[PDB]
PDB file of C-alpha atoms in Angstrom:
ATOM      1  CA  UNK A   1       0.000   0.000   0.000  1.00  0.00           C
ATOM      2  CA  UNK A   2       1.054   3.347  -0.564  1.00  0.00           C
ATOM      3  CA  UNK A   3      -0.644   4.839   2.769  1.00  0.00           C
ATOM      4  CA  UNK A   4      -0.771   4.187   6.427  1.00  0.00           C
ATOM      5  CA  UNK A   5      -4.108   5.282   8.471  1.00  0.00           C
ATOM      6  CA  UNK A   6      -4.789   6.901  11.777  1.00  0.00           C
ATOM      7  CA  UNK A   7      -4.399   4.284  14.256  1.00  0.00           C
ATOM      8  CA  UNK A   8      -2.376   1.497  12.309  1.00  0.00           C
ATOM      9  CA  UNK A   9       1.337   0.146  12.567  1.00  0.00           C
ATOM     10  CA  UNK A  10       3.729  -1.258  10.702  1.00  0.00           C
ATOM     11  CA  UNK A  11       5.764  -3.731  11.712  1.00  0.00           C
ATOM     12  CA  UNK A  12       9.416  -4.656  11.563  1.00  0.00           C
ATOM     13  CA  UNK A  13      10.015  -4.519   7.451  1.00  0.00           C
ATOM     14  CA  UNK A  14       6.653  -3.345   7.012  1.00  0.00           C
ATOM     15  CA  UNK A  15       6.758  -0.852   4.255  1.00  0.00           C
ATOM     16  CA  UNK A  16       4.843   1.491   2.447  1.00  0.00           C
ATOM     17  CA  UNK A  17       5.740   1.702  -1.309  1.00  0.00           C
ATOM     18  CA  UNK A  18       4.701   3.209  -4.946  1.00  0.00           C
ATOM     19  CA  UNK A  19       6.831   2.572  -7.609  1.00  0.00           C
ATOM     20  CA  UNK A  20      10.098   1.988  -7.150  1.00  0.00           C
ATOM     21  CA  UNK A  21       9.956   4.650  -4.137  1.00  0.00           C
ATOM     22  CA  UNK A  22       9.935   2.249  -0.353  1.00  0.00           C
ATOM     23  CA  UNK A  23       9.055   3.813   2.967  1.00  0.00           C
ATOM     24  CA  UNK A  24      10.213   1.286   5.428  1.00  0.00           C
ATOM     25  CA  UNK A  25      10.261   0.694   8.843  1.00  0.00           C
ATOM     26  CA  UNK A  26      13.415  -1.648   9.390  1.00  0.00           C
ATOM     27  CA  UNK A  27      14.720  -4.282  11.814  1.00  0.00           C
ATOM     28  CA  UNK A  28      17.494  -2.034  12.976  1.00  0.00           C
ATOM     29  CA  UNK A  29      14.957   0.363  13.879  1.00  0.00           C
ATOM     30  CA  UNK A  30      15.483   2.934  11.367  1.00  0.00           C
ATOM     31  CA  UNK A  31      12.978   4.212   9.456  1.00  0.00           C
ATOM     32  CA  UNK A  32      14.145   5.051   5.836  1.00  0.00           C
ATOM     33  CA  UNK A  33      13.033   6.193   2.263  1.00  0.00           C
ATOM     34  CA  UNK A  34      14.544   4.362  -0.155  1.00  0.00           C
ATOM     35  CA  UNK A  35      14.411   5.805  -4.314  1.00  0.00           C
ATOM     36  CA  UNK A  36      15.311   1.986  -5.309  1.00  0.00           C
ATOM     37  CA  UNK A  37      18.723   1.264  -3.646  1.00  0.00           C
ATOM     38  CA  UNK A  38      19.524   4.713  -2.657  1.00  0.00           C
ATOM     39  CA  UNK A  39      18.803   6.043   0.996  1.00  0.00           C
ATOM     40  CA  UNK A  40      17.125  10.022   0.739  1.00  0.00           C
ATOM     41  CA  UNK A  41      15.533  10.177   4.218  1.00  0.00           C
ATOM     42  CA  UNK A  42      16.291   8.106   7.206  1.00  0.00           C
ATOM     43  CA  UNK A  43      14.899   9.192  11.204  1.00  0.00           C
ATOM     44  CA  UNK A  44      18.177   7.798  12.227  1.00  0.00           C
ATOM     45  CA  UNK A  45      17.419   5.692  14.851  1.00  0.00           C
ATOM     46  CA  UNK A  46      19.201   2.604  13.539  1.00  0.00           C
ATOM     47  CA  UNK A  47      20.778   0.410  16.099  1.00  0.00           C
ATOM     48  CA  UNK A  48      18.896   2.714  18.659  1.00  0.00           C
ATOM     49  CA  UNK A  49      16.507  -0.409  19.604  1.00  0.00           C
ATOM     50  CA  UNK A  50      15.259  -3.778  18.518  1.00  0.00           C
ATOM     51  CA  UNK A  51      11.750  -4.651  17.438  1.00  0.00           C
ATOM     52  CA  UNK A  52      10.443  -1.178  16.497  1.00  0.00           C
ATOM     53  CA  UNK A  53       7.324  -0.326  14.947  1.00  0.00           C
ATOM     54  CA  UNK A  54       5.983   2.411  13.293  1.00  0.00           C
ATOM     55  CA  UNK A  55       2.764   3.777  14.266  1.00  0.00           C
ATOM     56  CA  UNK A  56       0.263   6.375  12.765  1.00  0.00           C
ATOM     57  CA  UNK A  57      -1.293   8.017  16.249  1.00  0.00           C
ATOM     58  CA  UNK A  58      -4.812   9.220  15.923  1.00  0.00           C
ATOM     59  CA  UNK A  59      -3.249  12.462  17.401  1.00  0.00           C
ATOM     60  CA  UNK A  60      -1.835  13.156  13.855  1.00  0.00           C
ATOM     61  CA  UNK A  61       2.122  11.939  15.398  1.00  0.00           C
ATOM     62  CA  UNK A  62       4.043   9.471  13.759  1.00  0.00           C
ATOM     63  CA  UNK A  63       5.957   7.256  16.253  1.00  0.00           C
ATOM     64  CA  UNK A  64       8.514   4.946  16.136  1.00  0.00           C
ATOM     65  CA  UNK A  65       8.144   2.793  18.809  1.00  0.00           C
ATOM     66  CA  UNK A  66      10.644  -0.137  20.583  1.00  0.00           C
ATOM     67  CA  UNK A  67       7.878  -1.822  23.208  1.00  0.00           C
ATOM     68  CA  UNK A  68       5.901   1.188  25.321  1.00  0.00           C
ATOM     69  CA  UNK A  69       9.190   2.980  24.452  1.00  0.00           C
ATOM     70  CA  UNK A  70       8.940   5.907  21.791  1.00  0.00           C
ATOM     71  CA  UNK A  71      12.525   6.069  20.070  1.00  0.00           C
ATOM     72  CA  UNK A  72      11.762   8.698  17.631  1.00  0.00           C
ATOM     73  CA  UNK A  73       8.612  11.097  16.770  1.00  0.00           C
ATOM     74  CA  UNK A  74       7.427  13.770  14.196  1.00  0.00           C
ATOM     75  CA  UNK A  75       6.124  16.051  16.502  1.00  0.00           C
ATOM     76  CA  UNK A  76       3.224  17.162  14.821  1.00  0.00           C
ATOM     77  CA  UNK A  77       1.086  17.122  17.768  1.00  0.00           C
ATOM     78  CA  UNK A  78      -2.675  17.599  17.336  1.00  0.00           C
ATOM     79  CA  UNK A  79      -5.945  16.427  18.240  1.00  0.00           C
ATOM     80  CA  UNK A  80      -7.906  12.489  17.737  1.00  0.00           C
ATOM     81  CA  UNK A  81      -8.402  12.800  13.970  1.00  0.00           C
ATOM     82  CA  UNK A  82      -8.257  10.661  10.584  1.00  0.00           C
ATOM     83  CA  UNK A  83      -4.670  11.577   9.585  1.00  0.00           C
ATOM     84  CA  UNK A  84      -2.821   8.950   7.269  1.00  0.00           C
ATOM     85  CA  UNK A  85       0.583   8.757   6.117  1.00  0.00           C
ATOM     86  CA  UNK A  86       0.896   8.770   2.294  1.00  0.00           C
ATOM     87  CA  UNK A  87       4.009   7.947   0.410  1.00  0.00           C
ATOM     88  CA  UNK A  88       3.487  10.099  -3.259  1.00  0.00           C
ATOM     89  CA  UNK A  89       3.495   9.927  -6.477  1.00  0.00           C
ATOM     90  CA  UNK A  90       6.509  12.697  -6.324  1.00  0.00           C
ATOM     91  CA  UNK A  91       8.579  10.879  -3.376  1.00  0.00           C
ATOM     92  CA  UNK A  92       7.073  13.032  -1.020  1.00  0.00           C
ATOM     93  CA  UNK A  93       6.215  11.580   2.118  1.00  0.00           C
ATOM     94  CA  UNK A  94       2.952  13.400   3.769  1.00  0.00           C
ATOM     95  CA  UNK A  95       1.242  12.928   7.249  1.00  0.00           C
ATOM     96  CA  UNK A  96      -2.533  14.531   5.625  1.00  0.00           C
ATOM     97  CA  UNK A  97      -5.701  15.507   8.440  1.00  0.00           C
ATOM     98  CA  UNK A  98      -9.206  15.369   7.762  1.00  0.00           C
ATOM     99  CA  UNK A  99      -9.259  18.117   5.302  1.00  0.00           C
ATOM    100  CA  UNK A 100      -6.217  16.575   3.381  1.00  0.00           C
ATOM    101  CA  UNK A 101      -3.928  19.645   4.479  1.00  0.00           C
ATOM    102  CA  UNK A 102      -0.227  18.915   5.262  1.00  0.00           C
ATOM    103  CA  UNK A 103       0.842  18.976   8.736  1.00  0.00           C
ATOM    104  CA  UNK A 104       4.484  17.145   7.851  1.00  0.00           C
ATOM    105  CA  UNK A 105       6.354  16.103   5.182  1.00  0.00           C
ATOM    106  CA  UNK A 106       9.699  14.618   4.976  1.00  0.00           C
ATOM    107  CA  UNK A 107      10.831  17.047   2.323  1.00  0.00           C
ATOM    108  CA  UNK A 108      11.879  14.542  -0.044  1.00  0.00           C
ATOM    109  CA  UNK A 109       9.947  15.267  -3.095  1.00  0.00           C
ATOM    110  CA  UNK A 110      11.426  15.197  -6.770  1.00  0.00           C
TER     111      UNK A 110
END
């Protein structure tokens, strides 16, 4: 899929992807955007933790977590919503609300 909803995980190598363009949260617990092969965005919590997840708060935050642990978030602190995390067509990475405005973005678009 290329989207994660409000209140939905992925797991360790769970992915998000569109085209050659993967969104993946890993087993070394870094989160990373690859463009094929090549790394362009990474949280850069790799070896921080084992068994992270990634999950899509209903409070509009994306969280990486490692058990009750949070290892790394967006900070894009709202209210209970329906946000989803979309991986686009232009390698963009988006966290969308209700009225499908950008609260953050990973900056990565081509």
């Amino acid at each position: 899929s290329d989207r994660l909803n409000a209140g939905k995980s992925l797991g360790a190598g769970g992915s998000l992807a569109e085209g050659p363009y993967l969104f993946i949260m890993q087993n070394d617990c870094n989160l990373v955007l690859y463009d094929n092969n090549r790394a362009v965005w990474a949280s850069g919590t790799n070896g921080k933790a084992s068994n992270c997840i990634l999950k899509m708060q209903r409070d509009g935050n994306l969280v990486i977590y490692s058990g009750s642990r949070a290892m790394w978030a967006s900070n894009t602190n709202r209210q209970d919503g329906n946000y989803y995390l979309i991986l686009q067509r232009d390698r963009n990475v988006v966290i969308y609300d209700n009225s499908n405005n950008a609260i953050w973005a990973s900056g990565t678009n081509v």
